[PDB]
Amino acid sequence: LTGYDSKSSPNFPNRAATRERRTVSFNARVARNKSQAKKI
Amino acid sequence: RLGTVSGNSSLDKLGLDKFLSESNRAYTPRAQPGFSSEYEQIISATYKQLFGNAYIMDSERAEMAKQESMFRDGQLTLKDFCRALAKTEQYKKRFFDSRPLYGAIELNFKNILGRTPDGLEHYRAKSAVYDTKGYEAFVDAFFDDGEYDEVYDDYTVPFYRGYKTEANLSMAAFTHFFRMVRGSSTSDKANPNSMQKDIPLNYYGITKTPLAVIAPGAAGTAYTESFAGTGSWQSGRAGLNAARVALGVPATANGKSFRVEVTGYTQPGFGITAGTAVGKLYKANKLSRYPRSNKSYVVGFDELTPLYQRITKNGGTIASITPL
Amino acid sequence: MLDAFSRVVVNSDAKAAYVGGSDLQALKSFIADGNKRLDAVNSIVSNASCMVSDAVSGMICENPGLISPGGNCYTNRRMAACLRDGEIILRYVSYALLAGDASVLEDRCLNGLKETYIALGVPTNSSIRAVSIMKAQAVAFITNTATERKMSFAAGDCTSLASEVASYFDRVGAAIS
Amino acid sequence: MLDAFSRVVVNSDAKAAYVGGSDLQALKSFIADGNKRLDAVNSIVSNASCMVSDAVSGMICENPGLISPGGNCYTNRRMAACLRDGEIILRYVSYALLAGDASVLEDRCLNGLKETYIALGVPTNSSIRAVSIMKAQAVAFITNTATERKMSFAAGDCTSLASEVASYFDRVGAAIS
Amino acid sequence: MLDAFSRVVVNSDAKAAYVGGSDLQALKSFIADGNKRLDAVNSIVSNASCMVSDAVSGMICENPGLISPGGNCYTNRRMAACLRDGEIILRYVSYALLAGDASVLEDRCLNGLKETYIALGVPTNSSIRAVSIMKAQAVAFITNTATERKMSFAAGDCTSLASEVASYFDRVGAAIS
Amino acid sequence: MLDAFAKVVAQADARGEFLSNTQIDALSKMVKEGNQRLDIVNKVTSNASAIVTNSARALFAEQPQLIQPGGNAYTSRRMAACLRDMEIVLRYVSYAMIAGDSSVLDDRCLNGLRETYQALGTPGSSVAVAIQKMKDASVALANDTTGTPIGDCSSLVAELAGYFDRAAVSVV
Amino acid sequence: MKSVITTVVSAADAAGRFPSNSDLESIQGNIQRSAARLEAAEKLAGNHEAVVKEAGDACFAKYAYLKNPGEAGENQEKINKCYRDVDHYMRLVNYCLVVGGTGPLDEWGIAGAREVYRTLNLPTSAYVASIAYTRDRLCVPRDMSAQAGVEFSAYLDYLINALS
Amino acid sequence: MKSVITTVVSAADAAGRFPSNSDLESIQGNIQRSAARLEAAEKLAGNHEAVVKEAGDACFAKYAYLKNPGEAGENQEKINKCYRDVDHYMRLVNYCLVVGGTGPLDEWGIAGAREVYRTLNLPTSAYVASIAYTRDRLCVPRDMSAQAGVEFSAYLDYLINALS
Ligand SMILES: *C(=C)C1=C(C)[C@@H](Cc2[nH]c(/C=C3N=C(/C=C4\NC(=O)[C@H](C)[C@H]4CC)C(C)=C\3CCC(=O)O)c(CCC(=O)O)c2C)NC1=O
Ligand SMILES: *[C@@H](C)[C@H]1/C(=C/C2=NC(=C\c3[nH]c(C[C@H]4NC(=O)C(C=C)=C4C)c(C)c3CCC(=O)O)/C(CCC(=O)O)=C2C)NC(=O)[C@@H]1C
Ligand SMILES: *[C@@H](C)[C@H]1/C(=C/C2=NC(=C\c3[nH]c(C[C@H]4NC(=O)C(C=C)=C4C)c(C)c3CCC(=O)O)/C(CCC(=O)O)=C2C)NC(=O)[C@@H]1C
Ligand SMILES: *[C@@H](C)[C@H]1/C(=C/C2=NC(=C\c3[nH]c(C[C@H]4NC(=O)C(C=C)=C4C)c(C)c3CCC(=O)O)/C(CCC(=O)O)=C2C)NC(=O)[C@@H]1C
Ligand SMILES: *[C@@H](C)[C@H]1/C(=C/C2=NC(=C\c3[nH]c(C[C@H]4NC(=O)C(C=C)=C4C)c(C)c3CCC(=O)O)/C(CCC(=O)O)=C2C)NC(=O)[C@@H]1C
Ligand SMILES: *[C@H](C)[C@H]1/C(=C/C2=NC(=C\c3[nH]c(C[C@H]4NC(=O)C(C=C)=C4C)c(C)c3CCC(=O)O)/C(CCC(=O)O)=C2C)NC(=O)[C@@H]1C
Ligand SMILES: *[C@H](C)[C@H]1/C(=C/C2=NC(=C\c3[nH]c(C[C@H]4NC(=O)C(C=C)=C4C)c(C)c3CCC(=O)O)/C(CCC(=O)O)=C2C)NC(=O)[C@@H]1C
Ligand SMILES: *[C@H](C)[C@H]1/C(=C/C2=NC(=C\c3[nH]c(C[C@H]4NC(=O)C(C=C)=C4C)c(C)c3CCC(=O)O)/C(CCC(=O)O)=C2C)NC(=O)[C@@H]1C
Ligand SMILES: *[C@H](C)[C@H]1/C(=C/C2=NC(=C\c3[nH]c(C[C@H]4NC(=O)C(C=C)=C4C)c(C)c3CCC(=O)O)/C(CCC(=O)O)=C2C)NC(=O)[C@@H]1C
Ligand SMILES: *[C@H](C)[C@H]1/C(=C/C2=NC(=C\c3[nH]c(C[C@H]4NC(=O)C(C=C)=C4C)c(C)c3CCC(=O)O)/C(CCC(=O)O)=C2C)NC(=O)[C@@H]1C
Ligand SMILES: *[C@H](C)[C@H]1/C(=C/C2=NC(=C\c3[nH]c(C[C@H]4NC(=O)C(C=C)=C4C)c(C)c3CCC(=O)O)/C(CCC(=O)O)=C2C)NC(=O)[C@@H]1C
Ligand SMILES: C=CC1=C(C)[C@@H](Cc2[nH]c(/C=C3N=C(/C=C4\NC(=O)[C@H](C)[C@H]4CC)C(C)=C\3CCC(=O)O)c(CCC(=O)O)c2C)NC1=O
Ligand SMILES: C=CC1=C(C)[C@@H](Cc2[nH]c(/C=C3N=C(/C=C4\NC(=O)[C@H](C)[C@H]4CC)C(C)=C\3CCC(=O)O)c(CCC(=O)O)c2C)NC1=O
Ligand SMILES: C=CC1=C(C)[C@@H](Cc2[nH]c(/C=C3N=C(/C=C4\NC(=O)[C@H](C)[C@H]4CC)C(C)=C\3CCC(=O)O)c(CCC(=O)O)c2C)NC1=O
Which positions in this protein are listed as binding (2R,3E)-phycocyanobilin 1 (chain F) (predicted)? Predict the structure, then answer.
């Protein structure tokens, strides 16, 4: 095993709450790390 | 104005008035072209919060032109602005390179997160990232963990929250908030517990020792005390501050016991008169009547009213009385 | 933070010792009465809502100056904060009853509460009547002695837990006075 | 925070009284003398950027050691901040004249300025000279008694509004001392 | 942002022309009929929460599929937000009536609403009906065509804003579509 | 401590300037009101027991929970410490009336009075009601024309009310 | 304390600017309302004991089940605490009429109302049954002027939406 | 566009609130000030070509050194790019007298002006001299009324305090 733990990366998509956030900030948190492969 | 009972409110009279008014919420993804008069308010509100009422001259600000341009483009407040701003040189100059490591952690909790490190493990969780991965990943750990995303939004400026019950820290970290944030007309360089050169909550932040809260603007707002341990194992000196315990037979005789803190002790204004003495002005060792201002006392109830008159009739002023 | 089991292992850590005969006998007794410890905690959290409404209304009807203009519980924002300042207090005492150790309300609730209430202006001589009422309610629930609510239980005795929960409720009044 | 109408409410709330024909008369003159107060803040926001630099130079011309190497206003960045420090003080006095009562500069500027200036090392005699200049600059602007600039008003009296803004400047010197 | 006053100052700016007596009558009648704008926002905001709950529970009495099992308005959590999605859009068209121009909500309320409702599966069939009956509650309050509420207003005409506020209600029904 | 004459000197010494001709006119106006300044502190210190006890009795008459068993004035010692504090404040207001400024009132009475009453548990809302009741018991007593020649005292009576309102607001 | 003055000196301190004529023309409207808005608070103060009694007696008369045992209106001291609970609300609407805005209402009575009536079992449906009586009982030719009753009835509807 | 309307609807939105009574009477003051703000705008709009001329050459009288080589006034096109640069500032004031507030100045004129004037080598002291010319020879019974001139000059000295 690598370290003391194996927590996931913050670069992984769908990691924040997205429960009762604003419509400006809801759309920012669903497309967190998906923009690259859509354009690839 | 001071007090806790006048306007049926108590937090806006501890120096948190102007902080209790603002939101700065950035109601759109990108900044609208053609105009700047709305996002300039968002930019400058982020500057006064993240740098902590610091002055940034217009040549110092012009170093950070690139960043302010991407945030005004289609990028976000926390990761593209507040994380970029804390990796500039105008941030690292004041809060990182001037201090030891624990001064940097206490100011990143205050600036980025708006609260206080309570306990040794909040320090150690952030200290260990610097030793293995340098500064540029040490700032990331204040952002890309599970505290920032659930409290502040993607486009809200990180307001202060270390005083309220929702930040589930402690009640000792409540008193530590009113040592860091000493009002609204104050900065980090401009408060007498950290002059941008030291660690503000060093012994009290590690051991979670609660402090007496002294309101900014009160008569006795200049109270500051120095630190020395006592006891022969840690090789310390007796006689600097007062104890915080009131342990013995003097605890419950003369009533219950309190801890009083005085600040202003000058050489004139001791005797039972109105004027200074004239003559030699000092004894043969020429120290002072009070070799340092900011004396603290431990006193019972039945000796509280004679002590009070000894404090005030000899020039001192009372900063805080807490029961022990 | 620390339970009854981890309290023992930090005492035998100082001795560089293991756990043997005499130091497991008081710990197996915790497991023995462990069904009664769960069976007492559930009797509190089942009806804690009436326990915090009756408690801060017993302080008010004893001290009528708390709802005067200029009283600490005068407006609705100050009264609603009182209704949850005591609901936080009851949450952490029921943690120390469940874990069998008072090192959880000592850390996250009691440490620094006295310096916090004197800053905000909360009268601490009237905050202790609200806890002493809750002390009388909590020992009248883990023994079936509540006047207007009877709860079914297995037969037996629970007076040791009545002195355990009364030591937690008295150190809340010892940390803020 | 608290304007003039917001001060008679909190004073009558401690009595838990209704505002009536004895307290409304003090505020009925406040709306009759409102077109003068609007006419007078306009005379100080207009001449604001010149009042600051005249007062930081006027402090320096009486204390020439303040630009000496070791003085508080030596370099550019220490001088640039004194022009900033001196106009946030003026900006809250233009607020407290606009509201009516002194509780916007008291709790946002003078709540914490005493220990601001004894941590940076700013001399508390030089700064209250720069306040006392702008005190005289605003009083001579409110009445049309300035030497080099006169502004066209409808004829009357503003002696009450002149002595009110002197009291706002006079407590800045009492606070940071 | 851009109200009815700021609408003419960018139309004249983009042609680089002074605003003059050719087009200062459209803002002369706007000011002279400004009390009708104040007598219309005050006749909406007095029951602004009431006309939500009559409409969000009036949407479902044409369509029982919303409180079907598996429906979009099934639980209490989804019913809390539907009454919350229904008080924002009413609040933001209050902002578009005090301003006089729609531009307060095409950058704040409607900027990207279409992509969030197709993310959560909020259907476009009901939200148009949810605002169409709230629009009919809006246009029936500024004139006195409401049934059990008849506010005492000064006489005149209000068919001008009634063709305006409903034009601010079908633009969201064309944006979320 | 300072008085109204040592206040102008301590102001002028910090600027190091010679007192103007129009600043001796202010101090010579201040001596012409000198007999009436003595006529107010004589009318107050000759009524001090009647000022306190008539205003203490009026306090517990409308706030009976102070002297109810359990309140913060139920004991003989908790009551004798209450009439002492109402006489402490009146003593340092009459000190601050011959002096002409509230410097002995702050440094020896009020700086620390709010911090004391938060520690002990004394309700600060009722110390205001106690202080405000002694103010108009003394203001109406200082407008007594008997024994003094009839003139005007309305700029000195308004000053005595200002010291009471300062000590009332510095405890809440 | 949201009033017209405290709106603009807190909007300006947000930006960090001086009061311009976007802050001076606001207080001109404070003069164009105080001649009639202060007229209602003059009438309400000298009449409130004749109004708070009529307001509660239109609540218990409709909500007659509240005087049953087990409820929140048991005995006389609870009903005496029910006129104390309403004569605050007729005092807080008096305080909002003199500050101009809705300052005292949304931070003294409203702020925290959802937790002090749900805990103490106080029905929030009876509060609106008494305030709407006072709104529907408002007769502008006799009792007021025609411009006080526009704005005096506008703060009761601020309560009703914030209680419902 | 920091006018009286767009500063109350931004204050309520930051709190999440409906437009309350403190918002509705700060826009009453917008009505009782337009009669002394709009007639000062059309008078500028019908006479801007003759007032920007005598204000333009005022800085070319005082700072007569400007027509040296290496400075702002070499050739005729630098004069034509100068009587345009001052013609805009009377238009942006004319927009601030029809929007009510100081909106169009501090986003189009003031914003970004300190850095375009430092690198193009334009001395700002001739801007504050040409502006303070037309600020100082208007007389209140002839060209305006006593209420339009205080409104007109207040947006004039907003420029000079922003440049200097
Ligand atoms: C069920 C199928 C059903 C309902 C539930 C109810 C809801 C509803 N109401 C309308 C029309 C109006 N609603 C109004 C709102 C109010 N009237 C009031 O007096 C109070 C203050 C307020 C409620 C808090 C108004 C003024 C109207 C217009 C007049 C009228 O009475 O019609 C609709 C719209 C119907 C449609 O066109 O689809 C609905 C759904 N009505 C139901 O039928
Ligand atoms: C809510 C009804 C609970 C409940 C709680 C219990 N309360 C108990 C004792 C108790 N209650 C009060 C408050 C009451 N006395 C007053 O004088 C006033 C107001 C003026 C009120 C509201 C007090 C003060 C006390 C204790 C006395 C003391 O120690 O100081 C209690 C213990 C047994 C009993 O008295 O019934 C309980 C269980 N009872 C319930 O059933 C629901 C769940
Ligand atoms: C004193 C506090 C009480 C009392 C306690 C007793 N409880 C006894 C047994 C018991 N209780 C439960 C339920 C409890 N166990 C759980 O696992 C959970 C939740 C997950 C709960 C709430 C159980 C299952 C049992 C075991 C036997 C049974 O009832 O079937 C008990 C007797 C057994 C023992 O002492 O170990 C006592 C004395 N009884 C009282 O009279 C007072 C009120
Ligand atoms: C004392 C400071 C001055 C002085 C003041 C007076 N001003 C008077 C009238 C006045 N000023 C204005 C402009 C002001 N009101 C606004 O609403 C705005 C912007 C939003 C501004 C800048 C107005 C409209 C008026 C009223 C004019 C009128 O109605 O005729 C004034 C006369 C009124 C009174 O006496 O009550 C006075 C005395 N004048 C002075 O001579 C000293 C130096
Ligand atoms: C259509 C919505 C109505 C209607 C509206 C009219 N209202 C008229 C005048 C008016 N409204 C008010 C109150 C308003 N002014 C304020 O300053 C505030 C709040 C701060 C409010 C709510 C006033 C003061 C006036 C002026 C006349 C008066 O004082 O009574 C009006 C006549 C003026 C015009 O037409 O320009 C109309 C038509 N009337 C209707 O018939 C429907 C129901
Ligand atoms: C001037 C000779 C050009 C020209 C320049 C403009 N650029 C404008 C906006 C803008 N530019 C950038 C790119 C910039 N940011 C970066 O981080 C980097 C490289 C690392 C570059 C080159 C961005 C991101 C933006 C967005 C707007 C903003 O940042 O606030 C611009 C318009 C400004 C506005 O819209 O307010 C201009 C005029 N444009 C031209 O026509 C000539 C060719
Ligand atoms: C009610 C029975 C009391 C009383 C309660 C009040 N508490 C007030 C504010 C407040 N209280 C706490 C302590 C609480 N929060 C915690 O996080 C923890 C421990 C985990 C505890 C015990 C805090 C931190 C605060 C600050 C406010 C906040 O966090 O939001 C309060 C004042 C509210 C206000 O200032 O408006 C009251 C009235 N006071 C009483 O009179 C009775 C005795
Ligand atoms: C000029 C008249 C003075 C003087 C001024 C200096 N002030 C300096 C720093 C400074 N001042 C403040 C307070 C200011 N900020 C506010 O927000 C408010 C009111 C709300 C005020 C009055 C702060 C917070 C700071 C710290 C700036 C920072 O740390 O970045 C200062 C030092 C600047 C520096 O060290 O870079 C000076 C020289 N000093 C004088 O000698 C005259 C009397
Ligand atoms: C009710 C009449 C509708 C309906 C409403 C629902 N909306 C739900 C979630 C939701 N809505 C929005 C937009 C709203 N948030 C904003 O910040 C703004 C503008 C400033 C608006 C208009 C967002 C961003 C979300 C995401 C989740 C959230 O933020 O709470 C929703 C589902 C809630 C849930 O999934 O838990 C419902 C039911 N849907 C309907 O069927 C009717 C037509
Ligand atoms: C003001 C609250 C009274 C009032 C006072 C007046 N007293 C006047 C003269 C005066 N007062 C005293 C007594 C004072 N001088 C002392 O030396 C001592 C203590 C030893 C005291 C108490 C004296 C001796 C004099 C005579 C000097 C003189 O004639 O001024 C006085 C002037 C008289 C006048 O103006 O006619 C006034 C006004 N008079 C009032 O009406 C209120 C109630
Ligand atoms: C008021 C202080 C004096 C006064 C001065 C004179 N001005 C003269 C001509 C003139 N004035 C202006 C400014 C004025 N005209 C406008 O169109 C506008 C704004 C839209 C303003 C403020 C201009 C532009 C001109 C030249 C062209 C023209 O006449 O319109 C003038 C006559 C010639 C001269 O001396 O320059 C005088 C005496 N006039 C007065 O009556 C009082 C004494
Ligand atoms: C929650 C789930 C979860 C995961 C699965 C990983 C997914 C993941 N892997 C990598 C990143 C990577 N992952 C691999 C792994 C592999 N490449 C190979 O050649 C092999 C096929 C395979 C393992 C045997 C490699 C080599 C990188 C490259 C790291 C780099 O680019 O430096 C990254 C980007 C780096 C980072 O964000 O830290 C992420 C998000 N992280 C997560 O959070
Ligand atoms: C200054 C702001 C201010 C308020 C807005 C009110 C709000 C308020 N009311 C009550 C308390 C109460 N309020 C009422 C009134 C009623 N109960 C009902 O069921 C009826 C609906 C209604 C009659 C009109 C009653 C009966 C109580 C006492 C309930 C109890 O504890 O027995 C309490 C608890 C403190 C107390 O018991 O007095 C508070 C904070 N009080 C305030 O001080
Ligand atoms: C819509 C708002 C708006 C403005 C406020 C101005 C502002 C402005 N002026 C100039 C540009 C200029 N402005 C001036 C004017 C002057 N130079 C001086 O020193 C005197 C103070 C003044 C004469 C009275 C001159 C001479 C130039 C040309 C500078 C150059 O091109 O080198 C430019 C650069 C583009 C250009 O060269 O035209 C801009 C943005 N233009 C605008 O479009």
Answer: 35, 39, 153
B26 contacts A24? CB cut-off 8 A: yes
Helices (H), B181-284: 203-207, 249-252
Q: Which domains does chain H have, with CATH numbers?
A: 1-164 (1.10.490.20)
- C73 contacts C66 by C-beta, under 8 angstroms: yes
C115 with B211: CB under 8 angstroms?
yes
Which of A2, A14, A18, A22 to mutate: most B Cβ within 10 Å?
A22
Give, using CA atoms, the residue closest to atom 17 of ligand 6: B66
Cα B315 versus chain centre, distance: 27
Q: Report the candidate in E42, G23, G21, G7 with the shortest Cα–Cα distance to residue H9.
A: G7
Cβ neighbours of D117 in B, within 8 Å:
190
Q: What is the largest CA-CA distance in chain D?
A: 62
Phi, psi of F128 (to 5 degrees): -65, -45
Give the position, in ligand 1's atom list, of the atom nearest the Cα of E50: 24
Cα–chain center distance at E144: 18
Strand ordering across the sheet containing B318-323: B296-300, B257-262, B318-323
Neighbours of H84 (CB within 10 A): 11
Please provide the DSSP assignment of G39-76 as one string: HHHHHHHTTHHHHHHHHHTTTTTT-GGGGSTTSS--SH
**Which atom of ligand 11 approaches the CA of H51 most closely?**
24
Angle between helices G76-87 and G48-56 (to 10 degrees): 130
Question: Nearest residue of C to residue B259 by CA position?
Answer: C115
Give yes or no for D35 touching G (CB within 8 A).
yes
CB contact under 8 A, D125 and F125: no
Q: What is the DSSP string of F39-103?
A: HHHHHHHTSHHHHHHHHHHHHHHH-TTTTSTTSTT-SHHHHHHHHHHHHHHHHHHHHHHHSSSTT
Closest to A10 in 3D by CA, of A23, A29, A27, A24: A29
Task: Please say whether the dihedral angle defined by the alpha carbons of residues E120, E126, E128 and E131, taken in this order, is positive or negative.
Answer: negative
Q: What is the count of residue pairs from B and D with beta carbons less than 8 Å apart?
A: 74
What one-letter code names the amino acid at F114? R
Q: Which technique?
A: cryo-EM
CB atoms under 10 Å from CB of H16, counted, come to 11
Domains of chain E, earliest start first = 1-177 (1.10.490.20)
Shortest alpha-carbon distance between residue D159 and chain C (Å): 37
- The answer on whether F83 is annotated among ligand-binding residues is yes
- Is there a contact between E67 and E60 (Cβ–Cβ < 8 Å)? yes
Q: How far is CA B219 from the centre of its chain?
A: 18
For the beta carbon of residue A19, count every other beta carbon within 10 angstroms.
Answer: 10
Chains E and D touch (3+ CB pairs under 8 A): no
In sequence order, the β-bridge partners of residue B323 are B258
Query: Ligand 13 mean position to G103 CA, how many Å?
Result: 21
CA angle E156, E161, E163 (to 5 degrees): 120
Resolution, Å (one decimal): 2.8
Q: Is B72 in the pocket of ligand 6 (CB under 6 A)?
A: yes
CA angle G18-G24-G30, nearest 5°?
A: 140
Contact H72, H122 (CB under 8 A): yes
Please compute, for residue B231, the number of CA atoms within 13 A of its CA located in the half-sphere on the CB side: 4
Q: Of all helices (H) and strands (E), which one includes residue B321? A: strand B318-323
Kindly identify which residue of chain C lies nearest to residue G114, measuring between CA atoms: C80
**With a 6 A CB cut-off, is H29 part of the ligand 5 pocket?**
no
Cα gap D96→D84, rounded to integer Å: 19
The residues in F 18-77 lying below 8 A from D, measured between CB atoms, are: none
Contact E98, A8 (CB under 8 A): no
